[PDB]
Design a protein around this nucleic acid. Structure first.
Ligand SMILES: [K+]
Ligand SMILES: [K+]
Ligand SMILES: [Mg+2]
Ligand SMILES: [Mg+2]
Length: 135
RNA sequence: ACAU
DNA sequence: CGATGT
């Protein structure tokens, strides 16, 4: 603790895993939805969590905001730190879209800079992250 | 085991 | 119960 309330919180929602993947980012304090990604027909939970963080980085950079990002995903936080999403999802025609988005997110990380702290939301102490889908 |  | 990840 404590929660850094002046922050952006992100989370993934899915119908199946692998399955339909979406994500959103919210103001940690107010819950206002700041962005939402159109559902992607096939992806994994961790790919969605990764895309959500990267989108948060791009969102905050465009707005000249120094707020941190919270995610509850140990995996996605690491993948962003590494600038490499180490997903097991097969590459085929069905997964081409998510893989294009993941590849492009990695490419963005490799061509841009940011100071945004990426923080682990401590679900066991604080409850569900504010961007949770309730599924 | 831990995080989803 | 299954799957995605470190
Ligand atoms: K949920
Ligand atoms: K497991
Ligand atoms: Mg999550
Ligand atoms: Mg959730």
């Amino acid at each position: 603790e404590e929660i850094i309330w002046e922050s952006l919180s992100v989370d993934v929602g899915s119908q199946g895993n692998p399955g339909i993947v979406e994500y959103k980012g919210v103001d940690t304090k107010t819950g206002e939805v700041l962005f939402e990604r159109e559902p992607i027909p096939i992806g994994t939970n961790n790919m969605g969590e990764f895309l959500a963080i990267v989108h948060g980085l791009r969102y905050l950079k465009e707005r000249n905001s120094r707020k941190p990002i919270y995610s509850d995903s140990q995996t996605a936080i690491k993948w962003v730190k590494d600038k490499k999403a180490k997903s097991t999802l097969v590459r085929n025609e069905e997964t081409a879209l998510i893989w294009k988005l993941v590849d492009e997110a990695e490419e963005w990380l490799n061509t841009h800079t940011y100071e945004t702290p990426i923080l682990k939301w401590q679900t066991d102490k604080w409850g569900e992250i504010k961007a949770d889908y309730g599924r």
